[PDB]
Ligand binder design. Structure first.
Ligand SMILES: O=C(O)[C@H]1CC(=O)N(c2ccccc2O)C1
Length: 358
């Protein structure tokens, strides 16, 4: 690696690992079309398995970027429209409160306060219909943003309905395979289990538990190499050969709503570059905990802005993930860890590395 990249990464990440007691970490810096990889510590403490460029980490809510892009691809295919009523793809959602709630609202957390989590009690598909039918919005659609799994999770499931493919099949066929993400999984196959890192919560080894709409909201697992490739694909979508996928990526980075300094895309979230870490942290949902914010509609949505800090945080019970890139500087970073550590620390470290290299 160029020494500047080596130095800034190691001098930032090593103290982070010490401070946060992170068992294992993988980092990719993408610089002008080139990835550079760095690994520390353990994927599995008990079995003394090191973190490599091949170990799988739970992305958690970074999965929402994949969901957003798949949704964008479906739009590009002419299969769905973000202006479509939710009921067009789920006509059994007949409860009145759903009148005026569009796929856009679901994708962007602006439906009127859909819950952050689907209850663990929701185990069947009839349970799921009951859940959405009985849900009572506190706000009119498109007035407030409330970050929620049940919102974008539903968007994901409905976005693939015209295709006739399962969410997993659609994601594999339309996003993973064309982008050569051959070690990215919604369900970790037996063949790749040796590479699947354990998460660590309160010193215990843990993996994400199954739940309703998990694949769509927080279910993707990936390597540092595939994630670097994912960032590069989103940094430079014009290089992508598949027309609808190229367009899908562009639609995910469109600015649909503004709350404070942050603009909501499909999965991705954006702020204007230059920006300081304290403004990024303030424009972030640091935990899955209620933060209701009035939104201003961007009418019509601004197409992907090159001078943006584009990012997403993710954190299952035992993992902490972060992805950020600045399109206009051909610069990106992926941070994958098998401990859920505070988001501000992730943002601080990512900014420190990217600011030095830009
Ligand atoms: O995005 C984040 O960093 C928070 C917010 C969120 O939805 N998280 C989350 C919650 C449940 C499963 C996976 C997750 O990533 C963690």
């Amino acid at each position: 690696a160029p020494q500047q990249i080596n130095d800034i990464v190691h001098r930032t990440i090593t103290p982070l690992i010490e401070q946060q007691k992170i068992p294992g970490m993988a980092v990719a810096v993408i610089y002008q079309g080139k990835p550079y990889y760095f690994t520390w510590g353990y994927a599995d403490i008990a079995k003394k398995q090191p973190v490599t460029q091949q170990t799988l980490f739970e992305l958690g809510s970074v999965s929402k970027t994949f969901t957003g892009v798949l949704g964008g691809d479906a739009i590009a295919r002419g299969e769905i429209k973000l202006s479509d009523p939710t009921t067009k793809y789920w006509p059994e959602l007949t409860a009145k409160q759903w009148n005026g709630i569009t796929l856009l609202h679901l994708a962007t957390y602006t439906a009127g306060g859909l819950p952050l989590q689907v209850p663990d009690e929701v185990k069947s598909s009839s349970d799921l219909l009951r859940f959405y039918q009985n849900w009572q919005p506190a706000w009119a659609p498109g007035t407030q943003r409330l970050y929620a799994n049940s919102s974008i999770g539903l968007f994901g499931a409905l976005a693939v309905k015209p295709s006739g493919l399962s969410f997993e099949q659609a994601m594999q066929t339309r996003v993973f395979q064309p982008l050569k993400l051959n070690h990215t999984w919604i369900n970790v196959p037996p063949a790749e289990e040796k590479n699947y890192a354990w998460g660590y919560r309160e010193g215990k080894a843990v993996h994400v538990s199954p739940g309703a709409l998990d694949a769509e909201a927080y279910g993707v697992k990936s390597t540092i190499e595939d994630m670097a490739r994912w960032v590069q694909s989103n940094l430079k979508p014009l290089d992508i050969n598949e027309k609808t996928l190229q367009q899908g990526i562009q639609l995910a980075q469109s600015r649909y709503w503004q709350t404070g300094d942050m603009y909501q895309g499909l999965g991705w979230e954006m702020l204007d570059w230059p920006v300081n870490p304290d403004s990024i942290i303030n424009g972030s949902d640091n935990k899955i905990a209620l933060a209701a914010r009035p939104v201003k509609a961007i009418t019509p949505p601004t197409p992907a802005v090159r001078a943006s800090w584009v990012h997403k945080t993710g954190a299952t019970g035992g993992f902490g993930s972060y992805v950020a890139f600045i399109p206009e500087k051909e610069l990106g970073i992926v941070m994958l860890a098998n401990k859920n550590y505070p988001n501000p620390a992730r943002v601080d470290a990512a900014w420190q590395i990217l600011n030095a290299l830009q």
